[PDB]
Write a protein that binds this DNA or RNA. Structure first.
Lengths: 315, 300
DNA sequence: GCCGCATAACTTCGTATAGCATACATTATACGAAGTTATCGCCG
DNA sequence: CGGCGATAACTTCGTATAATGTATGCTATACGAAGTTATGCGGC
């Protein structure tokens, strides 16, 4: 440990700093390698292409997702470059191994996984159910869900939202500007969020964040700083899935329940089935032209084939 | 030439997989390079970045398309790689020249050219013209075209099609499963057309056998249990019919002076775009991944 | 009115996995041409 | 009379140009889990 700690501090003395995810993951990798390499009683710091290859094949016996391994290799080349060692690990052995394990895993026919959608029908059902709720937590949560299903923001960005951002206007319509884009909230959900705001008294200071901690007492306490409890919001999605359905399946699989994506996905598919003009959608999404969108669209019934009819028809 | 044969067989040593197209084009690039390099009396096998520079300058003096010059560069990289030599031609000079000549070529403002469209209206016209025709080879060609405009594929895909592929159903509708795959449907009038072809020809009694097989100047057809690779001949059909609706080609020698294998697919695509409907599901049925090319079929 | 200590909400960590902009690597097309084939023409 | 001439109807080849694909350097995320706080629920 102290070896990697020291080496990473010596790198940090270059005063380059990664993303926190980046640096985290990097250190994790360094741990993993040094531990396996010591287990094989090989020098942990200086790599060897046959030792790296053996490691890689050990990982393949571990059954890891190829992408992971690839990521490992990337990390290693990164370390070389930024250490000033040969950025590429010796490509013949490395690339031949990569090609082998790539093709061998592709031959499994495995898929890049997709989060389950959250439907508009589910949203309407949970609205009908929770609208009866007197619990301010339930009011807040339904308001949050309505906001999400309108705006489809990044979860961290909806967590970022701060009362100085928010404005509302005729009909009770509400508008929120963020770095710089303003999005509009439709009248009924402006009234719902007003109910939340007024009942909680949360964030009377516009510095303060719209959603704030609520104790088991049922008491909100405002915060002048972000709670960042995105894991808690994910727990909300779990709870609501565990309300419309039971607990998660015992398979230990991912995507066994709704996730912060799932609403985004759902509304995207809803717009696709509505068939509204595509560039409109992409502009509203702030979105690069992306076949991801079409992988959404991919999962839809539209296969009418009318041209056979029109050929037979039209006469 | 035999020197080039020896040289390329030598480098072909350390054999590795290619498409036949890829190996053909590789060998053609090697021909061009070896001829040029011998003309320059330079070492044929080892590269030098100043030699690559001079070669590229010569290719620019020939005014070849920058895409093809780049492709040659690519091929050179390839041969280094697979022979075990350094992939990159020394990048800073190479890249700088690349960029500069790229800019200079884009400064020409040239267009991506597009094949001559074909319409339902054209189909109607040619059908009205040829429906009187007794020649079974004409019935063959027309049946072929009516399928193509129903299905709008690669020419290779339609070539593959085998009588075992084909079935027909209620209303006399006919369905064909193709690729790994998709089943497509044939509209009634062209069903009757293709049935006339099949019944008159007697072709492919075994469903192994292909729907279209050779004709003879005798006015005779010979069935084939094997793919005949008609496709170039099918292009000849497209050209012949173009030379029926019009005279000979212009002497400009340009591409897209007449209908091409694209022409039916692109045509029906624009037809649907003018119908203005079903964008994603029709793109699905044609199998395109979303691309600006689709837009420039649609754009007008 | 203090000790016990709970459920709950929340922080942090681990690791297995998913996004994506770009350069340049792999496959196909469009075309003019040479070369085939076997079948009929038909001399006198 | 049946040869070669000529053909239809076809195939293999060489040229130049595009369409198609992906992996690379950097980012963020899904789900379990231990651990944390805390104050309020329970007793006498």
């Amino acid at each position: 440990s102290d070896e990697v700690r020291k080496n990473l501090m010596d790198m940090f003395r270059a005063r380059q700093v990664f993303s926190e995810h980046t640096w985290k993951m990097l250190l994790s990798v360094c741990r993993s390698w040094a531990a396996w390499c010591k287990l094989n009683n090989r020098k942990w710091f200086p790599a060897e292409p046959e030792d790296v290859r053996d490691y890689l094949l050990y990982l393949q016996a571990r059954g890891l997702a190829v992408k992971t391994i690839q990521q490992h290799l990337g990390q290693l080349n990164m370390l070389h470059r930024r250490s000033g060692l040969p950025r590429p690990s010796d490509s013949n052995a490395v690339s031949l191994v990569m090609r082998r394990i790539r093709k061998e895993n592709v031959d499994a026919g495995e898929r890049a996984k997709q989060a389950l959608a959250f439907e508009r029908t589910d949203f309407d059902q949970v609205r009908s159910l929770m609208e009866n709720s007197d619990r301010c937590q339930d009011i807040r949560n339904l308001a949050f869900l309505g906001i999400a299903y309108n705006t489809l923001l990044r979860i961290a960005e909806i967590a970022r939202i701060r009362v100085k951002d928010i404005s509302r206007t005729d009909g009770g319509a509400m508008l929120i500007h963020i770095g710089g884009v303003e999005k509009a909230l439709s009248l009924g959900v402006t009234k719902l969020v007003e109910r939340w705001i007024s009942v909680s008294g949360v964030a009377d200071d516009p510095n303060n964040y719209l959603f704030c901690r609520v104790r088991k007492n049922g008491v909100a306490a405002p915060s002048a700083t972000s709670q960042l409890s995105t894991r808690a919001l994910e727990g909300i999605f779990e709870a609501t899935h565990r309300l419309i359905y039971g607990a998660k399946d015992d398979s230990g699989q991912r995507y066994l329940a709704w996730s912060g994506h799932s609403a985004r996905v759902g509304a995207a598919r809803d717009m696709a089935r509505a068939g509204v003009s595509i560039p409109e959608i992409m502009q509203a999404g702030g979105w690069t032209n992306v076949n991801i969108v079409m992988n959404y669209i991919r999962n839809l019934d539209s296969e009418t084939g009318a041209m056979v009819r029109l050929l037979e028809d039209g006469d």
